[PDB]
Amino acid sequence: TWRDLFYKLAEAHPDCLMLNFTVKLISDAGYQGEITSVSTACQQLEVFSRVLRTSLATILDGGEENLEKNLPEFAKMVCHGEHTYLFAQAMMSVLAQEEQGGSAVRRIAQEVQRFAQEKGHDASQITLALGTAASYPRACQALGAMLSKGALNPADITVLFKMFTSMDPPPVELIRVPAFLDLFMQSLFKPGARINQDHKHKYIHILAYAASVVETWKKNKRVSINKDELKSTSKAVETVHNLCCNENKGASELVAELSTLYQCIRFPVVAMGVLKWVDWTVSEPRYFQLQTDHTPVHLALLDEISTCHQLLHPQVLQLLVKLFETEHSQLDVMEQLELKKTLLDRMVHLLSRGYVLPVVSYIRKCLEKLDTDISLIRYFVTEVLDVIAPPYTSDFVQLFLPILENDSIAGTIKTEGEHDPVTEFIAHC
Amino acid sequence: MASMRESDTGLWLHNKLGATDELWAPPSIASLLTAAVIDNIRLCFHGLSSAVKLKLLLGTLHLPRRTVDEMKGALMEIIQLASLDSDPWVLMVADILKSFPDTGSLNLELEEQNPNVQDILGELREKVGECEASAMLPLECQYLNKNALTTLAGPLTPPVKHFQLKRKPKSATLRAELLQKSTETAQ
Amino acid sequence: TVINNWLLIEGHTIGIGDSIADSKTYQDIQNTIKKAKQDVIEVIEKAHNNELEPTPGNTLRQTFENQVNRILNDARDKTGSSAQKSLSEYNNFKSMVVSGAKGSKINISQVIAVVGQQNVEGKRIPFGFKHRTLPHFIKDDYGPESRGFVENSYLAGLTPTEFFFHAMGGREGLIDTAVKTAETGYIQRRLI
Amino acid sequence: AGILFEDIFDVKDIDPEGKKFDRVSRLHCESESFKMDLILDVNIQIYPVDLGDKFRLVIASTLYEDGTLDDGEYNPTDDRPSRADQFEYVMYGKVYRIEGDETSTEAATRLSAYVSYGGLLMRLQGDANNLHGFEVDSRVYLLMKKLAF
Amino acid sequence: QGIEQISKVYMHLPQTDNKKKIIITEDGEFKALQEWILETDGVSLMRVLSEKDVDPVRTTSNDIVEIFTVLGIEAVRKALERELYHVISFDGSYVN
Amino acid sequence: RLSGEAFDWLLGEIESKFNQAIAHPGEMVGALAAQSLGEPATQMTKNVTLGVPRLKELINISKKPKTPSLTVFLLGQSARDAERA
Amino acid sequence: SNRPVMGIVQDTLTAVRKFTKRDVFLERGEVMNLLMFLSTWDGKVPQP
């Protein structure tokens, strides 16, 4: 506390000598770390470089679970200073030049640039200048303007459609920035968003080219372009967009075309767009008041999303967590209980398809937070142990033994019967 | 557009770009770069502090394409004059930005007697080589189809198989139930 | 003066072309009318097999009448709205309605979409004969067209039964005028 | 002079709600230097434009360089030099509303000038610094000219 | 059971704020409330107002002779004014 | 944001306009009211029997109205529970 | 009912609605022809 008082005094009276003398005494005594170093880290080159290197090495050691932990501090240190952000993005782009294992480096760069944008600092045009957009100045200017203003305009989209549909399309990887695609999904999926009908075909073609059209690159050289997923994919995108953005139509009509819905929901970009549309559509609190099914079709589509693609599992988990954490004070508790039971079924399905660890951790956190009814937890664990069979991995048993350790499960699920899931799991371990 | 002298230009630069709290170069730098100031930086660049150099160099890219087109030679001159500063930050930034006015892109050269860059590149490359199978798929891979993902980062690698299932989960039951309901409703 | 002299250049008219739909709105109107007829038939058959829960405060017949009238009014309103959407900015009925010079939305609805239900004394066409409005119907028919619902528009023309029903509906207006004038003149004289 | 505001705009979008009127088109434009938004109604029948066009927009108090501040009545027989000789589209109207992010304590950083050219509306939304010649209930000339660059 | 010349009673929920219960909240808002009301088919006004759980302040009678007999001459004047206003402004017209 | 001169002009205009709204002595308000009430009566056509007949029952005090009724308001907690009504 | 009893009726109302639309433009000749019918005009042609 007294060291903090010295820091405050030195800030308030920089001219005074004793404050500088105390700062240097603190540095010599070994307490230089407690001295302000968030901005000092940016002004130092080699120490910041070594911190970045160690943080990224730890990130790649521990997987995504450790990347989620190391990302905040590392991103704040990098993006607090613009020069540090520029140098960091430069080294990430240089490392990502290699086609072998460069996906992780590109993801790191995307996380850094997203964090920088979330702080009100715009450097998307810098990233475009980093890439091979020199041969296509029109595309670079268009994308820079679109990302700078953060909206979707018909003029730049028309320009991009004209050039990409032409005989010499620009690098597709340039338009594969997550921010642009997120804005595009906001435009064509979120209810209440209006788009030009006369350019909707161009929008769909741009999205299809960015998502489904594939290119071969060797030594950063364009070799061949596969455009097979361009007609059926674009038609599926159009049909799904029409279904999602026609909010006047009831959910019954959407279920009536379930065959086409399932046929189109089997593509990754389309499936993720469907989940996003459901996300905004149900994000309205009044949707549950207008939702008259205990086990609705939206959750079935969520199950289909979980089954279809493995990479979309974190998004399904986030949507389910958003739904479950939503505590409602405007509906009867019974419908809330039914919705939570159905969400438990959905997240059991997520667990079944291999997405076990985050679901189990979320259940453990909820049980230790007492935000879930004991009946809900009992039914969830009963169904989990009903569907699953031995053997079980070390991580699963390590995460699930404390789950049974809670009395709220031992005193409820344990029943007198030949097939007792809790007793069976205790005995087998 | 007055001719601002070297001491006066340095005072102006350290007043407009003197915000140490604003480590981010403000968008106003787009309007802070004119012909006269860039021309007169030829003499006041010696007295600028390193933070001022970094802020100005980072703001040099936030310019319109037409402005860069009409202000080429002065910007080449300022880049070559920045390439003679004590801070290697300015040297490297000017070296890469020398190609910005020509093609609109940034040069890519590293490991040129840059020990921090050398260590970072070497360790990150060797770590990626160690964990090439366990890569970090970017967000667009969540959007890319099968062929695009295989071409970019290889075919999808399934996670660890925790266990096996004896009873079909109720999600399949819900799927079948709602398929039957949709068949009944549509027909 | 100024507006009338500019109208010599702009001009204004109304004709047959302003009373025509796009042949796609006609399909929507026909489908809506068919759905309304099916719903009324379903209500009638459910009444015949005695599955109506009586309204808490009213007789069974009156709630049957309420169901029929609600269905018919909903159908008429939907058809009118669909007709209004179809009108272009060049339409003369729309121009004369939005300015408020003459006409109303229901006028365009009746001209284009459907005339609607005819009513006497606030109720549907009564059983003038024994349990049928006209000899052309069967006894105890509570269907839409039997009790005085006009399913055609003024452009498409009225069939003889609905023409006679419309005449019945229109007679009451003249009768009401002829009695109300003399009724209210005395009230006004007493007040003054 | 009397140049209240000058900049280069590019047509980022044409009327997004649809063609309410056939002869009049709505335009949403962005700036290049000052980065301010523009909404304008134009007579598309006589001065047709399409997406991606760029133009110089010079809002001026008077058409005469000497700034003699004409009354504002139509006198076609005037041989004095005018700015309209170097512009393709000229409109004359009055500014009728000035908005801003004004707080009860400190000033406003963003302004929004609304002008009506006898029915055709224009809103210029930008930072407060570039909008200082706009005072409500004053006459304004449009003076836009397309660019071939 | 019941009171004579009361043929039947309708249970009603006022969807218009005129017959709704309006009470000023603690922070100044008006916040019109919705409460059940009864619409009879006869006139007592004396054995009805004496009934328990029946509001003796907001209960009207729609009949001016009975209101004159029960409440007075100013009350009948106010009731007559309200009846005239209702019967004139039902169609949507307005009279000063 | 009115200025001082504008405020003085506003006060003067209000004081001038109010005096012109005073009722003129000698105005035959009875005949005017009779006409202004008889005019809408010529332009008007659960069951409460509004319109001209209701106006006739009100104007001619009659002890036998067609549809007399009361609007009974529940006093306390019974105004919410349906069965308690 | 403290409101006017006289308004604009029939085709004058329709023509004044069609005349004040955003897309109504007049040449000089028709402008002078219309201005000839103003009783209270001051004789000054407004700037277009």
PDB file of N, CA and C in Angstrom, chain A residues 293-332:
ATOM      1  N   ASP A 293     -43.602 -24.371 -27.570  1.00  0.00           N
ATOM      2  CA  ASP A 293     -43.219 -25.775 -27.557  1.00  0.00           C
ATOM      3  C   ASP A 293     -42.242 -26.019 -26.418  1.00  0.00           C
ATOM      4  N   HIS A 294     -42.484 -27.088 -25.654  1.00  0.00           N
ATOM      5  CA  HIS A 294     -41.539 -27.469 -24.608  1.00  0.00           C
ATOM      6  C   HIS A 294     -40.191 -27.860 -25.199  1.00  0.00           C
ATOM      7  N   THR A 295     -40.198 -28.625 -26.292  1.00  0.00           N
ATOM      8  CA  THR A 295     -38.979 -29.073 -26.964  1.00  0.00           C
ATOM      9  C   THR A 295     -39.055 -28.556 -28.396  1.00  0.00           C
ATOM     10  N   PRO A 296     -38.647 -27.314 -28.638  1.00  0.00           N
ATOM     11  CA  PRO A 296     -38.909 -26.686 -29.936  1.00  0.00           C
ATOM     12  C   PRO A 296     -37.992 -27.204 -31.035  1.00  0.00           C
ATOM     13  N   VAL A 297     -38.246 -26.705 -32.247  1.00  0.00           N
ATOM     14  CA  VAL A 297     -37.463 -27.096 -33.415  1.00  0.00           C
ATOM     15  C   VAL A 297     -36.111 -26.393 -33.464  1.00  0.00           C
ATOM     16  N   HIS A 298     -35.977 -25.234 -32.814  1.00  0.00           N
ATOM     17  CA  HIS A 298     -34.697 -24.534 -32.803  1.00  0.00           C
ATOM     18  C   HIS A 298     -33.622 -25.384 -32.141  1.00  0.00           C
ATOM     19  N   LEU A 299     -33.975 -26.062 -31.050  1.00  0.00           N
ATOM     20  CA  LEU A 299     -33.023 -26.940 -30.382  1.00  0.00           C
ATOM     21  C   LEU A 299     -32.692 -28.163 -31.231  1.00  0.00           C
ATOM     22  N   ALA A 300     -33.652 -28.658 -32.014  1.00  0.00           N
ATOM     23  CA  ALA A 300     -33.350 -29.736 -32.953  1.00  0.00           C
ATOM     24  C   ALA A 300     -32.366 -29.275 -34.019  1.00  0.00           C
ATOM     25  N   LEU A 301     -32.539 -28.052 -34.522  1.00  0.00           N
ATOM     26  CA  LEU A 301     -31.564 -27.503 -35.457  1.00  0.00           C
ATOM     27  C   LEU A 301     -30.205 -27.342 -34.790  1.00  0.00           C
ATOM     28  N   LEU A 302     -30.191 -27.002 -33.499  1.00  0.00           N
ATOM     29  CA  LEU A 302     -28.929 -26.943 -32.763  1.00  0.00           C
ATOM     30  C   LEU A 302     -28.264 -28.314 -32.696  1.00  0.00           C
ATOM     31  N   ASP A 303     -29.057 -29.364 -32.460  1.00  0.00           N
ATOM     32  CA  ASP A 303     -28.519 -30.722 -32.491  1.00  0.00           C
ATOM     33  C   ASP A 303     -27.948 -31.049 -33.863  1.00  0.00           C
ATOM     34  N   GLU A 304     -28.655 -30.646 -34.919  1.00  0.00           N
ATOM     35  CA  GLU A 304     -28.169 -30.886 -36.274  1.00  0.00           C
ATOM     36  C   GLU A 304     -26.860 -30.147 -36.523  1.00  0.00           C
ATOM     37  N   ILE A 305     -26.744 -28.922 -36.005  1.00  0.00           N
ATOM     38  CA  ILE A 305     -25.502 -28.163 -36.133  1.00  0.00           C
ATOM     39  C   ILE A 305     -24.367 -28.890 -35.428  1.00  0.00           C
ATOM     40  N   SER A 306     -24.625 -29.373 -34.211  1.00  0.00           N
ATOM     41  CA  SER A 306     -23.597 -30.091 -33.464  1.00  0.00           C
ATOM     42  C   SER A 306     -23.160 -31.349 -34.204  1.00  0.00           C
ATOM     43  N   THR A 307     -24.116 -32.077 -34.782  1.00  0.00           N
ATOM     44  CA  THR A 307     -23.789 -33.299 -35.511  1.00  0.00           C
ATOM     45  C   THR A 307     -23.014 -33.000 -36.792  1.00  0.00           C
ATOM     46  N   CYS A 308     -23.385 -31.929 -37.498  1.00  0.00           N
ATOM     47  CA  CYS A 308     -22.897 -31.721 -38.860  1.00  0.00           C
ATOM     48  C   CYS A 308     -21.405 -31.415 -38.890  1.00  0.00           C
ATOM     49  N   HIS A 309     -20.947 -30.488 -38.051  1.00  0.00           N
ATOM     50  CA  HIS A 309     -19.567 -30.023 -38.104  1.00  0.00           C
ATOM     51  C   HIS A 309     -18.980 -29.971 -36.703  1.00  0.00           C
ATOM     52  N   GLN A 310     -17.735 -30.436 -36.573  1.00  0.00           N
ATOM     53  CA  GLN A 310     -17.062 -30.457 -35.280  1.00  0.00           C
ATOM     54  C   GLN A 310     -16.556 -29.081 -34.865  1.00  0.00           C
ATOM     55  N   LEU A 311     -16.167 -28.241 -35.828  1.00  0.00           N
ATOM     56  CA  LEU A 311     -15.643 -26.919 -35.502  1.00  0.00           C
ATOM     57  C   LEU A 311     -16.707 -25.986 -34.941  1.00  0.00           C
ATOM     58  N   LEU A 312     -17.984 -26.245 -35.219  1.00  0.00           N
ATOM     59  CA  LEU A 312     -19.064 -25.392 -34.740  1.00  0.00           C
ATOM     60  C   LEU A 312     -19.476 -25.699 -33.307  1.00  0.00           C
ATOM     61  N   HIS A 313     -18.906 -26.736 -32.695  1.00  0.00           N
ATOM     62  CA  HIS A 313     -19.278 -27.088 -31.326  1.00  0.00           C
ATOM     63  C   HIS A 313     -19.078 -25.954 -30.323  1.00  0.00           C
ATOM     64  N   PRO A 314     -17.976 -25.189 -30.337  1.00  0.00           N
ATOM     65  CA  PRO A 314     -17.883 -24.057 -29.396  1.00  0.00           C
ATOM     66  C   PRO A 314     -19.007 -23.046 -29.550  1.00  0.00           C
ATOM     67  N   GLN A 315     -19.455 -22.785 -30.780  1.00  0.00           N
ATOM     68  CA  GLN A 315     -20.547 -21.836 -30.981  1.00  0.00           C
ATOM     69  C   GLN A 315     -21.862 -22.375 -30.430  1.00  0.00           C
ATOM     70  N   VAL A 316     -22.135 -23.664 -30.649  1.00  0.00           N
ATOM     71  CA  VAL A 316     -23.333 -24.274 -30.079  1.00  0.00           C
ATOM     72  C   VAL A 316     -23.275 -24.219 -28.560  1.00  0.00           C
ATOM     73  N   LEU A 317     -22.101 -24.501 -27.989  1.00  0.00           N
ATOM     74  CA  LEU A 317     -21.941 -24.429 -26.542  1.00  0.00           C
ATOM     75  C   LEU A 317     -22.181 -23.017 -26.025  1.00  0.00           C
ATOM     76  N   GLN A 318     -21.650 -22.009 -26.722  1.00  0.00           N
ATOM     77  CA  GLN A 318     -21.859 -20.629 -26.298  1.00  0.00           C
ATOM     78  C   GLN A 318     -23.334 -20.251 -26.358  1.00  0.00           C
ATOM     79  N   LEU A 319     -24.030 -20.670 -27.416  1.00  0.00           N
ATOM     80  CA  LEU A 319     -25.456 -20.370 -27.518  1.00  0.00           C
ATOM     81  C   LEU A 319     -26.243 -21.057 -26.407  1.00  0.00           C
ATOM     82  N   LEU A 320     -25.908 -22.314 -26.107  1.00  0.00           N
ATOM     83  CA  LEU A 320     -26.594 -23.026 -25.033  1.00  0.00           C
ATOM     84  C   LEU A 320     -26.324 -22.380 -23.679  1.00  0.00           C
ATOM     85  N   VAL A 321     -25.086 -21.940 -23.445  1.00  0.00           N
ATOM     86  CA  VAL A 321     -24.759 -21.262 -22.192  1.00  0.00           C
ATOM     87  C   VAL A 321     -25.515 -19.944 -22.090  1.00  0.00           C
ATOM     88  N   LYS A 322     -25.619 -19.214 -23.203  1.00  0.00           N
ATOM     89  CA  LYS A 322     -26.386 -17.973 -23.204  1.00  0.00           C
ATOM     90  C   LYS A 322     -27.851 -18.231 -22.879  1.00  0.00           C
ATOM     91  N   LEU A 323     -28.423 -19.300 -23.441  1.00  0.00           N
ATOM     92  CA  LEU A 323     -29.819 -19.622 -23.158  1.00  0.00           C
ATOM     93  C   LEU A 323     -30.012 -20.025 -21.699  1.00  0.00           C
ATOM     94  N   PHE A 324     -29.124 -20.873 -21.174  1.00  0.00           N
ATOM     95  CA  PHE A 324     -29.307 -21.391 -19.821  1.00  0.00           C
ATOM     96  C   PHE A 324     -29.067 -20.315 -18.771  1.00  0.00           C
ATOM     97  N   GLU A 325     -28.032 -19.492 -18.954  1.00  0.00           N
ATOM     98  CA  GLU A 325     -27.751 -18.422 -18.005  1.00  0.00           C
ATOM     99  C   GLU A 325     -28.826 -17.344 -18.016  1.00  0.00           C
ATOM    100  N   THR A 326     -29.670 -17.315 -19.044  1.00  0.00           N
ATOM    101  CA  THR A 326     -30.748 -16.336 -19.136  1.00  0.00           C
ATOM    102  C   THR A 326     -31.812 -16.685 -18.105  1.00  0.00           C
ATOM    103  N   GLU A 327     -31.818 -15.957 -16.991  1.00  0.00           N
ATOM    104  CA  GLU A 327     -32.809 -16.147 -15.940  1.00  0.00           C
ATOM    105  C   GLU A 327     -34.019 -15.271 -16.243  1.00  0.00           C
ATOM    106  N   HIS A 328     -35.196 -15.887 -16.304  1.00  0.00           N
ATOM    107  CA  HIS A 328     -36.410 -15.215 -16.746  1.00  0.00           C
ATOM    108  C   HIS A 328     -37.289 -14.893 -15.543  1.00  0.00           C
ATOM    109  N   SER A 329     -37.682 -13.625 -15.425  1.00  0.00           N
ATOM    110  CA  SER A 329     -38.602 -13.172 -14.393  1.00  0.00           C
ATOM    111  C   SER A 329     -39.959 -12.774 -14.958  1.00  0.00           C
ATOM    112  N   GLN A 330     -40.266 -13.177 -16.192  1.00  0.00           N
ATOM    113  CA  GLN A 330     -41.514 -12.800 -16.840  1.00  0.00           C
ATOM    114  C   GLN A 330     -42.324 -13.981 -17.361  1.00  0.00           C
ATOM    115  N   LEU A 331     -41.900 -15.217 -17.103  1.00  0.00           N
ATOM    116  CA  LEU A 331     -42.655 -16.404 -17.478  1.00  0.00           C
ATOM    117  C   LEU A 331     -42.777 -17.336 -16.281  1.00  0.00           C
ATOM    118  N   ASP A 332     -43.670 -18.312 -16.415  1.00  0.00           N
ATOM    119  CA  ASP A 332     -43.857 -19.310 -15.374  1.00  0.00           C
ATOM    120  C   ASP A 332     -42.613 -20.182 -15.234  1.00  0.00           C
TER     121      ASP A 332
END
